[PDB]
Design an enzyme around this catalytic site. Structure first.
Site, short mmCIF file in Angstrom:
data_model
loop_
_atom_site.label_atom_id
_atom_site.label_comp_id
_atom_site.label_asym_id
_atom_site.label_seq_id
_atom_site.Cartn_x
_atom_site.Cartn_y
_atom_site.Cartn_z
N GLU A 76 0.72 -1.30 -0.13
CA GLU A 76 -0.06 -0.07 -0.04
C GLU A 76 1.04 1.30 0.17
O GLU A 76 0.32 2.34 -0.40
CB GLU A 76 -0.78 -0.09 1.44
CG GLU A 76 -2.03 -1.08 1.11
CD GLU A 76 -3.18 -1.13 0.19
OE1 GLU A 76 -3.26 0.21 -0.34
OE2 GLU A 76 -3.89 -1.97 -0.08
N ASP A 132 -6.58 6.77 -4.70
CA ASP A 132 -5.88 5.19 -5.04
C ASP A 132 -6.16 4.87 -6.61
O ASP A 132 -6.33 5.69 -7.51
CB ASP A 132 -6.92 4.33 -4.12
CG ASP A 132 -8.23 3.91 -4.45
OD1 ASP A 132 -8.71 4.40 -5.66
OD2 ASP A 132 -8.75 3.19 -3.73
N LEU A 190 -8.89 3.89 3.01
CA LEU A 190 -10.27 4.52 2.10
C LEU A 190 -10.87 5.53 2.90
O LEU A 190 -11.28 5.33 4.04
CB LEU A 190 -11.16 3.59 1.42
CG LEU A 190 -12.23 4.29 0.66
CD1 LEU A 190 -11.64 4.86 -0.43
CD2 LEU A 190 -13.26 3.20 0.27
#
Ligand code: CL
Ligand code: CL
Length: 162
Positions: free
Chosen positions: A11, A20, A32
């Protein structure tokens, strides 16, 4: 290597709101914020998540805190899920980390949708499962990350991450 170091590699870490791979507003280690198009709706969710007026920027500690909550929630979602739990209970420690990684990225609902692959994993048909996992939108959209997770399922080692 462990789940935390694995997800940190997949990530990255960003201290400013970013978009993203799907174009959604995110911050820190893959956290998120919202699927809404509004940067203001994002700042608002962020402030709510941190408990202060952030103006879109957080510190490393704050990022790590969100991350610890997110991994905890992923595990707990797996354990509460009737489709996931039996899969998770059947796997060794490394492969368990692989399943946690998919849930963190895609959510419990999405992963529970991989019916055929879940069945193959439970049966310990490694090669077969790796092939079926690759026939997905997931693999086509984020191929390098998907290959890493898939190799982890195939081998039961951390090789893809070294
Ligand atoms: Cl939150
Ligand atoms: Cl990728």
């Amino acid at each position: 290597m462990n789940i935390f170091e694995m997800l940190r590699i997949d990530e990255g870490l960003r201290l400013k709101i970013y978009k993203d791979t799907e174009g959604y507003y995110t911050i820190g280690i893959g956290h998120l914020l919202t699927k809404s198009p509004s940067l203001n709706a994002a700042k608002s969710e962020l402030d709510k998540a941190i408990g202060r007026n952030t103006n879109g920027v957080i510190t490393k500690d704050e990022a790590e805190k969100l991350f610890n909550q997110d991994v905890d929630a992923a595990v707990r979602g797996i354990l509460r899920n009737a489709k996931l739990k039996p899969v998770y209970d059947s796997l060794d420690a490394v492969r368990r980390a692989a399943l946690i990684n998919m849930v963190f990225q895609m959510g419990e609902t999405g992963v529970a949708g991989f019916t055929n692959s879940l069945r193959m994993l439970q049966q310990k048909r490694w090669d077969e499962a790796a092939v079926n996992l690759s026939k997905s939108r997931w693999y086509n959209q984020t191929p390098n990350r998907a290959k890493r997770v898939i190799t982890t399922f195939r081998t039961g080692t951390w090789d893809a991450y070294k």
